[PDB]
Amino acid sequence: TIVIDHEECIGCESCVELCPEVFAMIDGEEKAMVTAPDSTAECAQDAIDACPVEAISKE
Amino acid sequence: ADGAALYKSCIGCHGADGSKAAMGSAKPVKGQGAEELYKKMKGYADGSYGGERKAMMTNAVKKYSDEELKALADYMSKL
Ligand code: HEC
Ligand code: SF4
């Protein structure tokens, strides 16, 4: 699980290029289109340090 | 110079004016001047510069095609 623990974005489009269609490249300037929130794809564990609330838990 | 107005995409990595890089470990290159930034930024697309993360910057240079950086980042000659 990508537990985006609450969703927020402030942009970044960042994690899409880590988890390529797991976040899909629609960022909705508070949202990113997390298409596949099941996938503990460890590249998104970097992108905790680009969420403003560091708001990706994984499980 | 426009920056912030089309920087809406990039805020989570930077703040407003290159003022962080946050990717995770990323180089906050600020204390710069527009020309150098433009060269570095073009460099990111052509593989003539890179960074630790730096593929998002490649995409940014590509989709803000790689003249819109003169709108965006050619600003940052304050630091
Ligand atoms: C979030 C994933 C990013 C997006 C989208 C944008 N930038 Fe970025 N930028 C990011 C990183 C990780 C880095 C550091 C390099 C590394 O990989 O270690 C940068 C760097 C810059 C710089 C510094 C100067 C340079 O190297 O050219 C500038 C001035 C900069 N970024 C500007 C910028 C603009 C204008 C963007 C909005 C369109 C933008 N960045 C998006 C990460 C991210
Ligand atoms: S790294 Fe976080 S705040 Fe940034 S686009 Fe991705 S989910 Fe959003």
Chain A residues within an 8 Å CB radius of B59: 13, 17
How many domains are there within chain B?
A: 1
How many domains are there within chain A?
A: 1
Q: Is A33 strand, coil or helix?
A: strand
Region of residue B62 (phi > 0: left; psi between -120 and 50: alpha; otherwise: beta): alpha
- Across A26-51, b (16+ Cβ under 10 Å) vs e yields ebeeeebebeeeebebeebbbbbebb
Provide the residue range defining the domain that includes A19.
2-58
Instruction: Please state, in angstroms and rounded to a whole number, the distance separating the CA atoms of residues B12 and B4.
Output: 12
Indicate the annotated binding residues of B for heme c. 10, 13-14, 57
A49, B13 Cβ separation under 8 angstroms: no
**Which tokens hold the place of A32?**
């990113």
In the block, tokens 């402030």 appear at A10
Q: Is A26 strand, coil or helix?
A: strand
CATH number, domain with residue A8: 3.30.70
Provide the residue range defining the domain that includes B67.
1-79
Report angle CA A12, B54, A30 to the nearest 5 degrees: 5
Residue ranges around ligand 1 (CB below 6 Å):
A 12-14, 50; B 7, 9-10, 13-14, 18, 21, 23, 26-27, 29, 37, 40-41, 51-54, 56-57, 60, 64, 72-73, 76
CATH number, domain with residue B46: 1.10.760.10
B54, B40 Cβ separation under 8 angstroms: no
Q: How many residues appear in chain B?
A: 79
In the block, tokens 């564990």 appear at A45
**Which tokens hold the place of A40?**
């503990």
C-alpha separations of A35 from A6, A17, A59, B16, B66 in Å? 16, 13, 17, 28, 29
